[PDB]
Amino acid sequence: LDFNYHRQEGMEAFLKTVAQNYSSVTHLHSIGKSVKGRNLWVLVVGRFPKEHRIGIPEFKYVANMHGDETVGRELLLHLIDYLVTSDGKDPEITNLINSTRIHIMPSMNPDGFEAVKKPDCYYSIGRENYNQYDLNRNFPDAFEYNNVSRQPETVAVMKWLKTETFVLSANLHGGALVASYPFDNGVQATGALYSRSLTPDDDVFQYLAHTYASRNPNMKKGDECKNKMNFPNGVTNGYSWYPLQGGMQDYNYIWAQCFEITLELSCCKYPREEKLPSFWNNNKASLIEYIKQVHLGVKGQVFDQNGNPLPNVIVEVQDRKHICPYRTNKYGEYYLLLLPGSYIINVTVPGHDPHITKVIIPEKSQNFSALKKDILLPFQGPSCPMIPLYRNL
Ligand SMILES: *[C@@H]1O[C@H](CO)[C@@H](O[C@@H]2O[C@H](CO)[C@@H](O)[C@H](O)[C@H]2NC(C)=O)[C@H](O)[C@H]1NC(C)=O
Ligand SMILES: [Zn+2]
């Protein structure tokens, strides 16, 4: 692709075309429409695109939810191309594109983007959805009723997040240059008084933020954005930054069972075209190294003694119980991003004693797949109200 901006027509175009020229390993669809009839295109890239496949983890990149934050819109289109055209020629990337099913959403709020005609670094007519709402302040909140008009895009995504067993994510932003991990909101129980809101998996989230930023020359600088605040190593907790109520990152992790972190890829929210090559350049390796992380820890499926995948069962590590507990999918498989170390998973099938099953998670993988571990229970065999769970917790 070319390195200029790609409003709706041309970006859409690109996509549809990538659709044709590479149908063997791509699939484009739409999880919904803006409040303006604009399309929420997603492009999946995988060995067998179009259908989740037991074993291969699902991965996404949502970007442009803030109208005016354009770098990510463009990085995702360009990431897209990279992958299709690297497929087959570059081995490592090919091994990856094989081993995973990558879904890309270049622009969750296109009405916002289109809206601005006079580009700018700190403010604009875009950002908010067409009803002036902040799409990253519009999701259910596990901390304090975010009673607000759920918007088309917000909803489209919620359902979409339901359509697949997404394992690892990251929604792109501009306006700062840092990688923010959860929770973006908090409670004393999580340590709001220390100006920090930690997750059961703060270590994997930290490792994940660092993964991405360590690979961004500037994001790594820490002392980078002028009119903005800066961070060390380019990573930070959401709360230690700014308690964010009703954000997608928190949602994905609470109710959607997947890990999302926020990538703040540019100081200047809507930079000049001439700068994209550089933006592509200072992010390339970071997008790839991040996606690649969808293979941390273990995965597998769970069956009863008649070798039948029991879905909806709870499978989580001994001391990592989630507010809304992680269950298996319709295929009874389970995915748990974890760091190198020895674990104990408690398989608790409804109305049963939790089943122990121990696993040592390697310490360097030679392939692009998590550790596989199937569970045979020695017997036989709705999510959570989207209401502030942690509050009264
Ligand atoms: C990665 O997946 C690709 C799928 O495109 C594999 O390559 C193709 O494999 C088919 C087998 O049905 C061959 O007929 C094609 O010639 C291959 N396409 C080309 C030229 O790349 C590839 O072998 C896989 N590599 C792995 C498993 O690492
Ligand atoms: Zn933003």
Swiss-Prot record:
Residue positions the entry lists as glycosylated: 21, 98, 147, 346, 367
Regulation: Inhibited by O-phenanthroline and MGTA and activated by cobalt.
Active site: 264
Disulfide-bonded cysteines: 121-268, 225-267, 324-384
Main location: membrane
Effect of residue 264 to Q: Abolishes enzyme activity
Domain of life: Eukaryota
Cofactor(s) needed by this chain: Zn(2+)
Catalytic activity entry: Cleavage of C-terminal arginine or lysine residues from polypeptides
UniProt-reported outcome of changing residue 260 to A: 5-fold decrease in substrate affinity. 22-fold decrease in specific affinity. 104-fold decrease in catalytic efficiency. Greatly reduced heat stability
Domain Peptidase M14: 4-294
Binding site for Zn(2+): 66, 69, 173
Protein's GO biological process: anatomical structure morphogenesis; peptide metabolic process; protein processing
InterPro entries in the cross-refs: CarboxyPept-like_regulatory, CPM_N, Peptidase_M14, Peptidase_M14_domain
EC number: 3.4.17.12
Site-annotated residues for Probable structural role: 260
pH dependence: Optimum pH is 7.0.
UniProt xrefs under CDD domains: M14_CPM, Peptidase_M14NE-CP-C_like
A GO CC annotation given for this chain: extracellular region
Membrane-protein topology: Lipid-anchor; GPI-anchor
Cofactor note: Binds 1 zinc ion per subunit.
Described function: Specifically removes C-terminal basic residues (Arg or Lys) from peptides and proteins. It is believed to play important roles in the control of peptide hormone and growth factor activity at the cell surface, and in the membrane-localized degradation of extracellular proteins.
PANTHER family (UniProt xref): CARBOXYPEPTIDASE M, PROTEASE M14 CARBOXYPEPTIDASE
Family: Belongs to the peptidase M14 family.
Protein name per Swiss-Prot or TrEMBL: Carboxypeptidase M
Species name: Homo sapiens
Phylogenetic placement of the source organism: Eukaryota, Metazoa, Chordata, Craniata, Vertebrata
